[PDB]
């Protein structure tokens, strides 16, 4: 009864970071070894928990959050970070105790002439709370004049394309990210290691 981590890590298409996807994992055996033994990953940071000790703990739910950002933004997927991604797109809590996993996806997510299909939120009235998701396309009021849903001076569309060309510097190449969160509730702990 294997946890379906394959569906997340090996998905053909990933979400834009503003529209990040969550998979709820429950009622299954989690083989964390397949992840922590892999040569596929450039980032594999776990905060106060080791994939090794996960193999003898049970959780009520595990969440796998997945999306694309550029290489130099992977550092923002960590507790206590700021920047466009942490502030407006995907926010970890200060007390995060899960894992952040990332790999270069230049082969899949870039194309000659530019892949523009991956977006991020460039403007927002306030910072996201941890694990908050905002997919609104409200015209953003940068000035004192209301926009009334009409773009113009100081009235902007809040989303912006990444420009992923395969010749980009590695800092500007696409990275696929999976964030694992481990949840223990009053209810039965049914996600266990082997």
């Amino acid at each position: 009864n294997l946890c379906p981590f394959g569906e997340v890590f090996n998905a053909t298409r990933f979400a834009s970071v503003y529209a990040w996807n969550r998979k709820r994992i429950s009622n299954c055996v989690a083989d964390y070894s397949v992840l922590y033994n892999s040569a596929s990953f450039s980032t594999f940071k776990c905060y106060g928990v080791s994939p090794t000790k996960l193999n003898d703990l049970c959780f009520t739910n595990v969440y796998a959050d997945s999306f694309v950002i550029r290489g130099d933004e992977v550092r923002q997927i960590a507790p206590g970070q700021t920047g466009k991604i942490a502030d407006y797109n995907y926010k970890l809590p200060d007390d995060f105790t899960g894992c952040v996993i990332a790999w270069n996806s230049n082969n899949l997510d870039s194309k000659v002439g530019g892949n523009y299909n991956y977006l991020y939120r460039l403007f927002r009235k306030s910072n996201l709370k941890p694990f908050e998701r905002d997919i609104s396309t409200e015209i953003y009021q940068a000035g004192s004049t209301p926009c009334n849903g009409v773009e113009g001076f100081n009235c902007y569309f809040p989303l912006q394309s990444y420009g992923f060309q395969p010749t980009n510097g590695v800092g500007y190449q696409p990275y696929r990210v999976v964030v694992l969160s481990f949840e223990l509730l009053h209810a039965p702990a049914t996600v266990c290691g082997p």
Partner: nanobody
Amino acid sequence: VQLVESGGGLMQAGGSLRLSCAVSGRTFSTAAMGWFRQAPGKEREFVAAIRWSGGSAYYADSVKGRFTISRDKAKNTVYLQMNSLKYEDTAVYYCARTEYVSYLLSDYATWPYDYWGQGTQVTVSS
């Protein structure tokens, strides 16, 4: 992916024509559509753009108050309503499509678009 234009043709000055541009084939996303025109022996020039999301429009100074760009998302079609036609409006009109999302609508006036239609003749007579 194909952009299929229709409408336009011959109309006397002061009259109104509507151009259509239908997008066919599998698309992942559409950021914006635009109309451009090329008069014989002149460079192709921007006419109008519309953001697919929200429908905000951006116009060349030469067509403000005369032309309206609009789009039907369900029909994947963009339209140019060409009112108060002048001899200067005589040109081949091209629709264009991009998946590039800029926060800044005015960027669609100068952005190099990814996909182009075959072009549709508009001729304004006396």
